[PDB]
Amino acid sequence: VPTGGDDPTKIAMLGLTFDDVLLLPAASDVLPANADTSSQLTKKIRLKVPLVSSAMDTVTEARMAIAMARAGGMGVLHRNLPVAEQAAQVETVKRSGGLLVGAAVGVGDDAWERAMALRDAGVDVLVVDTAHAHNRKVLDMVHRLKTTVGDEIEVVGGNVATRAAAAALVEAGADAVKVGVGPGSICTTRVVAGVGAPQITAILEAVAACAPHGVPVIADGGLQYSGDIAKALAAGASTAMLGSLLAGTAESPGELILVNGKQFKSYRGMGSLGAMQLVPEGIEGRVPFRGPLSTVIHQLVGGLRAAMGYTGSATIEELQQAQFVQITAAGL
Amino acid sequence: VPTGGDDPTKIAMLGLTFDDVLLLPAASDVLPANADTSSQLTKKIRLKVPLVSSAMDTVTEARMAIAMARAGGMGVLHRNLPVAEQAAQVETVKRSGGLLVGAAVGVGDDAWERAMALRDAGVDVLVVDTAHAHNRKVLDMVHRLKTTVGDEIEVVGGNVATRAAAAALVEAGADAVKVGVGPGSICTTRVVAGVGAPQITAILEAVAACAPHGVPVIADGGLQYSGDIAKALAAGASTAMLGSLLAGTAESPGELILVNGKQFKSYRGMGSLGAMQLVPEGIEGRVPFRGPLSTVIHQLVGGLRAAMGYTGSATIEELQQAQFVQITAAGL
Amino acid sequence: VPTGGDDPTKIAMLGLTFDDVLLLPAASDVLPANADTSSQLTKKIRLKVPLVSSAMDTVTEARMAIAMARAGGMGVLHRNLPVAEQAAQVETVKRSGGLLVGAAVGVGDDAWERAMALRDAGVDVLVVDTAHAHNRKVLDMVHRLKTTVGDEIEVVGGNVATRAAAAALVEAGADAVKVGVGPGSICTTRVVAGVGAPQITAILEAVAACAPHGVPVIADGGLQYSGDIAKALAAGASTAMLGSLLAGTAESPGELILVNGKQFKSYRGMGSLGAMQLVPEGIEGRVPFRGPLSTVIHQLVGGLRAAMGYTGSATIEELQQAQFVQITAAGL
Amino acid sequence: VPTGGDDPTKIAMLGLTFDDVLLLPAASDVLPANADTSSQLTKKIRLKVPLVSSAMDTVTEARMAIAMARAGGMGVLHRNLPVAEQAAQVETVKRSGGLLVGAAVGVGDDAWERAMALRDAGVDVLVVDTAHAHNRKVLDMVHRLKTTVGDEIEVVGGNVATRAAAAALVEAGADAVKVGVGPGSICTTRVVAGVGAPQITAILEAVAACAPHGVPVIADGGLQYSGDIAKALAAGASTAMLGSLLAGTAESPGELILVNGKQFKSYRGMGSLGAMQLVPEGIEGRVPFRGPLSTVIHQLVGGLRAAMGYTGSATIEELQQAQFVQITAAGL
Ligand SMILES: O=C(c1cccc([N+](=O)O)c1)N1CCN(S(=O)(=O)c2cccc3cnccc23)CC1
Ligand SMILES: O=C(c1cccc([N+](=O)O)c1)N1CCN(S(=O)(=O)c2cccc3cnccc23)CC1
Ligand SMILES: O=C(c1cccc([N+](=O)O)c1)N1CCN(S(=O)(=O)c2cccc3cnccc23)CC1
Ligand SMILES: O=C(c1cccc([N+](=O)O)c1)N1CCN(S(=O)(=O)c2cccc3cnccc23)CC1
Ligand SMILES: O=c1[nH]cnc2c1ncn2[C@@H]1O[C@H](COP(=O)(O)O)[C@@H](O)[C@H]1O
Ligand SMILES: O=c1[nH]cnc2c1ncn2[C@@H]1O[C@H](COP(=O)(O)O)[C@@H](O)[C@H]1O
Ligand SMILES: O=c1[nH]cnc2c1ncn2[C@@H]1O[C@H](COP(=O)(O)O)[C@@H](O)[C@H]1O
Ligand SMILES: O=c1[nH]cnc2c1ncn2[C@@H]1O[C@H](COP(=O)(O)O)[C@@H](O)[C@H]1O
């Protein structure tokens, strides 16, 4: 084996990230303004805009969830707070009209009661929210939720970064599979544990397991530009989950911070010291202040629409069939 | 597939940019001073120097077009101004002698009248000027122009980045095909839409469709050094279109700007906020002030002549047969 | 041959370093807190934590060796001091309880007497400590030690970076093989001599020679993050030797240094000018002050435990069977 | 073709530079101090140290040539001065004892008289000194010199970067072939003309043409570290020519320059504006002041000796058979 040892499977693939590829233009009759950006979040739920906000305490509470839903996407409420308060945030969202909302739950001992309280509050989507879903406890939670509340609530499981893990969630009854182990902007798992999977390859692999079963893939983490949304969807994802790109908005939790004459907001991993309060797998950082959510979503969707024009994609389902060119470090 | 999924066509190629390759020296009896730098701009029009200036409002108005023609190249007048004023710029150029001039038109509702006014003003070349020519409206415009004014005016279509798109323009009747989706120095399409094609590969692909039909390729965007002109032509282009490299010259529109004791000129994408005045796909920047055009062209052509000496290319047609070595990130 | 000449063996492999790969998550029933981190240092000696401190005069003297042993690892006492003083350091360690300790010896004329004095002092492990063990003098020293004191002392030989060199040490009777030629943070061998081997490939190759003979591999040099420990072990090493990562700790030799308001400690190669006091193959530098050893080891082991959770590795022997994905320069 | 077009020969190879490879250690009985560093400069001339100084006006005049010869290498006197003065520099060198010396000549109209004056002055080596030797005028000059003064003077031709060009010089009667088109530290040919060849690949290719005819290869340009000398020789070169590495020495022409509290010397390409006094293919820069030549050579040879120890190379001829590992951008 060219890279060492005698086992060709030891280094099992070459992982590509968003920056490694560009979408190729193709024959097009599609004007950006007329593209249909709707897409499946889950088997049953279709969003007008294929974007959901991260389940993080510096990204999504009620205000963000309301704004995301009004913009045609959805928020996933974070779970770093008492069950009663999270359920109260769900009720706050539902009191602003017929707005979709999701909420994260873990697999710990309080997870089941949390899930039931969220169900009682009218949640539309439960996200079984872990760093590594290829685990019996996570698969069992997904299955139990689907068998118990599955007729009224869509159940998302994650996160995964391999075909086999995606396949396991599908078998457990997941209504969507969330992909991303290691790619988050505030993630240190790659350096702390040495574990991860570049996101374009992770999506291609997860999609290979999920698409044949009609299960949508949510691309979660590592998206830094509007163009990355188009790349994620072209790799076969049905929606993208955004943390960093939304953390600087007015609607995210937290105050405005002024450093060196510039405006920022705090953005921190849920595995950071501050969020857990230990072996942290996230950092506490800041992102530039970006103004209203509605405006940020406009620009993100605008970039997606441009990509749909260039690739001749009238719908997100067509964009999922677009082709890439791999680029070098020289090219950017 | 090593990079993910089961479809070998999903990542369809490895795209190389100028920085990824160098021209190999070959046996030579050619002195740089004696090389013939002439080349086809279009099927009928041969330039003394294989260089044309970008159709941009910080690059080419009448003064630049006149200087480019006198230097042996050509200018393409930008279309970000009223039809009457663009036609007046054509007449200004033709009043400075028997100088070649081109002018850009779009495919919007005013495009046809603009084209006819330019024809009336004596324009030699019409450039159907879009970001993505693989589209029925663009192909129809190229065809209608060729069938209507084609005996007196050469019609260029662009831009493309794939073999199939180049082939479509050829079939529509293009007299030249302009290549470049995403590579411009001021371009943000790669990050906003996630779309693009590294330019050496784009030229190789377009040439594969155009050369067998005797249609010249204009390499447009991403050229940062005189050596890139030689690389573009060796990849099979017949001319290069330059924006950034010419924007700092005396003859470009705009004033001199002084920042930190150094001289610059403004250079902005036609898809920037300022040019359109929205989802911008270009930035507004600056380039170092470079002095007279004639002098910049001297240095650019000087580099091209050096490359022709090293590669044993007596003519541009011979340079189109030169070979490359691919280099690593370490090498530069 | 694509890279030049006609000999495919001239460039014999593509060498990967830690930064070139990530560990892939796999199905897991393993909680980080419950993983078994124990591993073979040598054929007979199993450590609770698979970490040993470098035999360097800015890393390991008695205080460090004691702290490493108490933390479940081991120290290798440096040999840049008189024989009597090194033996006295061994006795200091053994007087702090039943603590494992190793000590470095060379192959020069004083090496044999040094080894015997260390034996007399109660040393558990002798490390034949060279930059290049594929040499008759080094193999002879390993063999003579194993035949003379091998029943009471485990003998480590190093360093190697190739399969053949590892095989030679195995044949000579080594109880462990230490891998690393060129990768150390303070190493300049790569630039001074132009010699080296990227560490992931070096480990894969050495393991191919050592594992079939039941000889553990110690990965020595180039580890910069806790995640690199997991990568080294997954490549097949049984323990990791750390210099830079431990040099900033309270227990390392040397004083605290204050520069620009920040705390550091000196860290220098044993091939640096200062250590030898010539053609140096190491530099004299500094590392950030890190606090107590016990705390640094906690974080390092914490990262390893996280990796074991993600990869479903209940033991280090299972982690040695984990798989990698190769990443690009874009990905990190 | 993965990189574009339908012609697999268009991008003819992947070119590696020094930074792309490391030498692999191999079984060794060689101590650095006992390696034999002697090597053929030309078919007849063997140097004690395989190093020659560049024919540049900021590197080699009489003082440098004398010091290089005393150190066991050789200087090549630059030709940017009147014939009478260059010949006088040769006589100055020969008046310091039985010291080898070379001198550069071009192929212009004064080249033949220059060569004869140098012959009359007692020069040992004539270097036909061009940027591109694959040219009838250069091959003719090499041949005419070899047929006219070849019994008393060794004739070097250069520079080349391809197998075919090297083969042409061999056929013309060259006693050595000098390799390097584009790699020099002060070279801008790669950016001005877009022409070049990464040096490890260039050496491998030239050696494939030269070694079977017993013609030594001089690796000229791009060497930045002592380790690069070992890499160049292992790729099959017999000597290395150094510009930048020797330009900072006391013996080079030019004065000491003080900027920002640090000492430098001017170092400029022979294709720079200043040297020619136009389309320059070199820059005028500076290098850190390095002290006496003898000391710099000691360190360079020291690194080479280290490499010979690691690779088990008793002689330069053995080092020419050593193997490489290719490294990634991550590895350094
Ligand atoms: O009409 C569009 C547009 C937007 C989205 C999709 C689309 N399409 O065709 O499917 C078309 N635009 C107008 C202006 N351009 S541009 O930035 O100014 C520009 C001009 C010329 C050469 C380009 C080469 N590559 C990039 C962009 C270039 C981009 C946006
Ligand atoms: O005669 C030419 C010239 C120009 C253009 C083409 C050409 N040719 O041969 O086809 C020849 N020049 C004179 C001086 N050189 S140089 O920069 O000084 C220089 C000198 C020696 C080693 C070189 C190694 N690679 C790069 C350049 C080097 C370049 C320009
Ligand atoms: O439970 C664990 C843990 C630790 C070690 C091993 C392990 N396991 O499953 O085998 C699990 N953690 C809790 C929180 N996360 S996280 O950083 O906050 C985080 C959250 C969501 C998405 C992630 C995507 N990739 C990285 C980390 C992400 C990491 C640590
Ligand atoms: O004996 C030599 C030497 C020199 C040249 C050739 C040679 N040989 O064996 O063929 C041997 N040295 C003494 C000390 N080392 S070291 O820098 O301190 C050092 C120590 C331990 C681990 C190393 C891992 N890779 C690099 C160097 C390391 C290098 C120089
Ligand atoms: O602390 C952490 N470490 C690693 N990943 C995290 C952490 N917190 C959240 N994440 C994940 O990172 C995603 C956001 O990534 P981003 O959009 O690149 O900032 C989130 O949706 C999570 O999947
Ligand atoms: O706003 C923009 N976004 C992307 N491409 C542009 C824009 N404006 C002009 N271009 C193209 O970029 C070319 C100039 O590229 P440059 O020479 O690299 O600066 C122009 O000829 C256009 O093809
Ligand atoms: O001077 C030196 N040059 C090269 N390698 C050294 C030197 N001194 C120690 N080493 C090796 O570098 C290892 C530490 O590497 P680090 O953990 O990356 O800092 C040590 O265990 C040695 O194997
Ligand atoms: O102006 C120049 N442009 C390109 N190459 C040059 C020039 N002047 C000298 N050279 C070559 O560069 C070599 C020195 O390269 P260096 O050792 O990397 O600095 C010289 O021996 C020449 O072969």
Tab-separated table of N, CA and C in Angstrom, chain A residues 215-264:
chain	number	residue	atom	x	y	z
A	215	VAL	N	-35.096	8.544	3.022
A	215	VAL	CA	-34.829	9.259	4.264
A	215	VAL	C	-33.928	10.459	3.972
A	216	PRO	N	-34.417	11.673	4.252
A	216	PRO	CA	-33.587	12.853	3.958
A	216	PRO	C	-32.393	12.984	4.894
A	217	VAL	N	-31.343	13.591	4.362
A	217	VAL	CA	-30.120	13.847	5.101
A	217	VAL	C	-30.003	15.342	5.398
A	218	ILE	N	-29.726	15.659	6.658
A	218	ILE	CA	-29.470	17.032	7.079
A	218	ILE	C	-27.961	17.199	7.226
A	219	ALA	N	-27.376	18.093	6.435
A	219	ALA	CA	-25.945	18.388	6.516
A	219	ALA	C	-25.675	19.373	7.646
A	220	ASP	N	-24.972	18.929	8.680
A	220	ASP	CA	-24.829	19.704	9.906
A	220	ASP	C	-23.377	19.978	10.247
A	221	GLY	N	-22.960	21.223	10.043
A	221	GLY	CA	-21.642	21.651	10.470
A	221	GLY	C	-20.686	21.888	9.320
A	222	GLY	N	-19.864	22.917	9.469
A	222	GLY	CA	-18.797	23.179	8.519
A	222	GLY	C	-19.184	24.097	7.385
A	223	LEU	N	-20.442	24.524	7.341
A	223	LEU	CA	-20.867	25.423	6.271
A	223	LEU	C	-20.462	26.844	6.631
A	224	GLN	N	-19.650	27.467	5.783
A	224	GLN	CA	-19.128	28.791	6.103
A	224	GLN	C	-19.577	29.876	5.143
A	225	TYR	N	-20.100	29.470	3.991
A	225	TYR	CA	-20.524	30.396	2.947
A	225	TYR	C	-21.833	29.915	2.366
A	226	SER	N	-22.583	30.813	1.733
A	226	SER	CA	-23.827	30.417	1.091
A	226	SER	C	-23.595	29.319	0.054
A	227	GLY	N	-22.435	29.355	-0.601
A	227	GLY	CA	-22.113	28.371	-1.613
A	227	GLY	C	-21.992	26.975	-1.036
A	228	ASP	N	-21.631	26.879	0.242
A	228	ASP	CA	-21.540	25.575	0.882
A	228	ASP	C	-22.901	24.908	1.027
A	229	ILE	N	-23.961	25.706	1.126
A	229	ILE	CA	-25.307	25.142	1.195
A	229	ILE	C	-25.600	24.433	-0.118
A	230	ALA	N	-25.291	25.098	-1.226
A	230	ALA	CA	-25.498	24.481	-2.523
A	230	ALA	C	-24.664	23.222	-2.682
A	231	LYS	N	-23.419	23.265	-2.206
A	231	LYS	CA	-22.561	22.087	-2.303
A	231	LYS	C	-23.118	20.931	-1.468
A	232	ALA	N	-23.589	21.231	-0.260
A	232	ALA	CA	-24.122	20.194	0.619
A	232	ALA	C	-25.329	19.514	-0.011
A	233	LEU	N	-26.213	20.321	-0.592
A	233	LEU	CA	-27.414	19.774	-1.221
A	233	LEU	C	-27.070	18.995	-2.493
A	234	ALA	N	-26.114	19.498	-3.266
A	234	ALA	CA	-25.698	18.783	-4.461
A	234	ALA	C	-25.053	17.448	-4.143
A	235	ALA	N	-24.373	17.360	-2.998
A	235	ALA	CA	-23.811	16.091	-2.531
A	235	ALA	C	-24.908	15.115	-2.112
A	236	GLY	N	-26.124	15.629	-1.958
A	236	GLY	CA	-27.274	14.777	-1.758
A	236	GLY	C	-28.059	15.074	-0.498
A	237	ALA	N	-27.587	15.999	0.337
A	237	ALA	CA	-28.373	16.400	1.503
A	237	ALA	C	-29.673	17.047	1.050
A	238	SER	N	-30.666	17.031	1.929
A	238	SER	CA	-31.949	17.674	1.651
A	238	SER	C	-32.106	19.013	2.361
A	239	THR	N	-31.408	19.186	3.485
A	239	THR	CA	-31.378	20.466	4.191
A	239	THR	C	-29.999	20.636	4.793
A	240	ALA	N	-29.706	21.860	5.217
A	240	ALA	CA	-28.483	22.173	5.938
A	240	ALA	C	-28.810	22.777	7.294
A	241	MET	N	-28.077	22.355	8.319
A	241	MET	CA	-28.149	22.951	9.648
A	241	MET	C	-26.967	23.900	9.864
A	242	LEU	N	-27.288	25.110	10.322
A	242	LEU	CA	-26.315	26.190	10.432
A	242	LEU	C	-26.166	26.700	11.844
A	243	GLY	N	-24.925	26.790	12.300
A	243	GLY	CA	-24.611	27.354	13.593
A	243	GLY	C	-23.921	28.689	13.416
A	244	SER	N	-22.652	28.658	13.026
A	244	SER	CA	-21.853	29.870	12.865
A	244	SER	C	-22.518	30.934	11.992
A	245	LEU	N	-23.112	30.509	10.880
A	245	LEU	CA	-23.699	31.462	9.933
A	245	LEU	C	-24.897	32.209	10.495
A	246	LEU	N	-25.504	31.682	11.560
A	246	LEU	CA	-26.700	32.290	12.156
A	246	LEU	C	-26.436	32.877	13.537
A	247	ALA	N	-25.300	32.526	14.130
A	247	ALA	CA	-24.969	32.960	15.486
A	247	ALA	C	-24.749	34.469	15.611
A	248	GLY	N	-24.392	35.122	14.515
A	248	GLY	CA	-24.179	36.558	14.568
A	248	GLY	C	-25.428	37.405	14.367
A	249	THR	N	-26.599	36.777	14.325
A	249	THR	CA	-27.814	37.506	13.980
A	249	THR	C	-28.498	38.068	15.211
A	250	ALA	N	-29.351	39.063	14.984
A	250	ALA	CA	-30.066	39.714	16.075
A	250	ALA	C	-30.863	38.716	16.897
A	251	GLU	N	-31.433	37.723	16.223
A	251	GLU	CA	-32.354	36.780	16.857
A	251	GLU	C	-31.693	35.677	17.678
A	252	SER	N	-30.380	35.517	17.551
A	252	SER	CA	-29.679	34.518	18.352
A	252	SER	C	-29.604	34.994	19.802
A	253	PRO	N	-29.484	34.059	20.753
A	253	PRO	CA	-29.325	34.481	22.149
A	253	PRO	C	-28.007	35.216	22.346
A	254	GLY	N	-27.921	36.028	23.390
A	254	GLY	CA	-26.655	36.638	23.737
A	254	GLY	C	-26.542	38.105	23.387
A	255	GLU	N	-25.631	38.816	23.996
A	255	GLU	CA	-25.552	40.215	23.723
A	255	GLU	C	-24.525	40.542	22.681
A	256	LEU	N	-24.581	41.782	22.300
A	256	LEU	CA	-23.630	42.341	21.364
A	256	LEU	C	-22.327	42.607	22.105
A	257	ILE	N	-21.205	42.258	21.484
A	257	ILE	CA	-19.895	42.488	22.080
A	257	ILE	C	-19.061	43.406	21.193
A	258	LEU	N	-18.412	44.389	21.805
A	258	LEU	CA	-17.589	45.330	21.061
A	258	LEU	C	-16.114	45.098	21.350
A	259	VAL	N	-15.373	44.647	20.345
A	259	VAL	CA	-13.921	44.543	20.487
A	259	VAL	C	-13.207	45.184	19.299
A	260	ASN	N	-12.195	45.995	19.603
A	260	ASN	CA	-11.431	46.715	18.585
A	260	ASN	C	-12.289	47.498	17.586
A	261	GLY	N	-13.376	48.086	18.073
A	261	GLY	CA	-14.241	48.906	17.242
A	261	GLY	C	-15.194	48.130	16.349
A	262	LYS	N	-15.227	46.809	16.507
A	262	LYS	CA	-16.095	45.969	15.688
A	262	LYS	C	-17.093	45.191	16.547
A	263	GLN	N	-18.268	44.918	15.982
A	263	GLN	CA	-19.334	44.232	16.703
A	263	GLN	C	-19.322	42.726	16.471
A	264	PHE	N	-19.459	41.980	17.562
A	264	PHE	CA	-19.504	40.523	17.515
A	264	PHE	C	-20.590	39.982	18.434
